[PDB]
Write a protein that binds this ligand. Sequence first.
Ligand SMILES: [Zn+2]
Ligand SMILES: [Zn+2]
Ligand SMILES: [Zn+2]
Ligand SMILES: [Zn+2]
Ligand SMILES: [Zn+2]
Ligand SMILES: [Zn+2]
Ligand SMILES: [Zn+2]
Lengths: 84, 438, 96, 59
Amino acid sequence: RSGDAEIKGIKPKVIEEYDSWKSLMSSAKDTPLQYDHMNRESLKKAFNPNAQLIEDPLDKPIQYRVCEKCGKPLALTAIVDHLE
Amino acid sequence: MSICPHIQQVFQNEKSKDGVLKTCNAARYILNHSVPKEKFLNTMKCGTCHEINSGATFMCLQCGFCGCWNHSHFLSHSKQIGHIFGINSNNGLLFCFKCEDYIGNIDLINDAILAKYWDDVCTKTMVPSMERRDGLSGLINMGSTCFMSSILQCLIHNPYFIRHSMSQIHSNNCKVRSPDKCFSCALDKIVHELYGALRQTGFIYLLTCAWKIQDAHEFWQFIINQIHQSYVLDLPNAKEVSRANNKQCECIVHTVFEGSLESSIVCPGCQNNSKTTIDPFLDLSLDIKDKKKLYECLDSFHKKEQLKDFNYHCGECNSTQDAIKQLGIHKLPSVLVLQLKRFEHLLNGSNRKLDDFIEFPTYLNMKNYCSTVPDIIYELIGIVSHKGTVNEGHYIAFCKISGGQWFKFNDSMVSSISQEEVLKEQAYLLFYTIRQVN
Amino acid sequence: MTMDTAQLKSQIQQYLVESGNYELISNELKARLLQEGWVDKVKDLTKSEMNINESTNFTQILSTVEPKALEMVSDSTRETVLKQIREFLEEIVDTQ
Amino acid sequence: TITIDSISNGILNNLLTTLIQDIVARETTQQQLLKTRYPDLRSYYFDPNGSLDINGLQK
Ligand SMILES: [Zn+2]
Ligand SMILES: [Zn+2]
Ligand SMILES: [Zn+2]
Ligand SMILES: [Zn+2]
Ligand SMILES: [Zn+2]
Ligand SMILES: [Zn+2]
Ligand SMILES: [Zn+2]
């Protein structure tokens, strides 16, 4: 064990156990919402199964627009329903 | 303030535009719906150097390449192949490699999920006005109502409650549909005024619902329970009402603020652990007497105490040894609400307010306060303090809005204030929102 | 015969990800940086530099924030996390 | 040539720079949006002496 040691290769013992970004789309379609930094195994144990989660809740301001007719502030995903 | 002229050039062609938006929507979709390993190896591996996280990694708009920043490999690609736009795979923001800057000021790109409906959207809805964009506004007292308004401020700057309200969830399901009859509705009106253009009409309409039924904590429990009623009342049948009352409610309150405690009572003599219980909470009341740090109060809350209970005989073994009781968190909420118990009521009939300054962190770790552990970190976003005596006093809220800037709400007065000043508050309620879970 | 060092460094990073350990390292680091106030410090510094340089341009701004952001990382965090990476690398690599 | 030290420092630096770049991206983009959305953008008022509200006013 030595930080200064030249690395020869990967341990052969370890080795035993082993391109478009767009090609990810079909696995993503089958994959539920994922968080950068909230571990699912741990949200299963420590949090209520039906818990809401907003990761980095303050890292951007709330994305909304305001209805010109009635002044209501609408979440992006509420806008199309509110109009149509 | 200019706007990348290169993406403007692409938007002239109507077909090339829709390719850009379809792609932005796809990348962002993939980024929200890939498992860590997948993400690392397929959105943060560099096409050229094959390093993971060589700084930011950009997913090309026009092809499948991904290129790192620290070695200018996306820049190279943009120069070599002429593909000058990439999405940052940590955040889905779009970079122009000729401007050497992010394109953040184009609403259509920001709101790309609405691309198919854009001409409708952008003519029939406006961006929020400068004054209302962070919901900042005093709420006048008008009759010993700072315990109401200060609670309300933390609520209407709560990311979960804002999202819920602006999502129109309640509006589209409410049966009572009346600000003067229904609480959730009244709160909806306040969000309307503070974030849109309709600024006490909502808060006015909130005392009128209170006409139909001093401590800010009691009002917190009061108001969230009302919100929960309103949800129960909108439910389509008796069966769902039973569930939401007796089993698992799925309303905003019960999926944001509710945790549960394990209350373990064990008898030394024979380890009988039978008065052990799992009890819901919507906040935690901590003792602060002769304490100086929130973590000490949590240690207190969590430590084994002896139950002084005359003249107890272990149901199971007859031992007169005090039962050992310990509290631990069995399930944590997304927003943890802490009450420091400052208003000590006395057997002699009087009251005390404890003024002890309790130090509290901007990031709180609850890992040691659970029960059978990895880091479980919350971010302070709200504080309510009490000024004055038990008799005549007021309440003041403090909220951390987006960006990291803190404000102070003193009835009509709203005022900027530093994080360093907020931390020196004599805190009463503390609102912490879940931030990281290892 | 020697190996491509560039290609080896990549495979090493790849074993870290496959084993689960890259997520651990990454998460220990963020949790550490978050609790020492570094994220909030990096955000303040960015704002200061935007004010000073009267620019929101990412590249310009990054150039002045990044070098200082790295210095602000504490020794405890830097040391702790390097220890952790090192031990993970010992499981993976052979050494001449 | 590569050593345990070279590689570990590499990995730490990759992580740190990535994260720094993320934080800065979000701040500058947010501020770019705000300045473009509101050509007349006024920061909210600050007062050392605790007296002036977000628009430099009082009760
Ligand atoms: Zn409308
Ligand atoms: Zn450009
Ligand atoms: Zn590269
Ligand atoms: Zn390309
Ligand atoms: Zn209603
Ligand atoms: Zn409920
Ligand atoms: Zn017993």
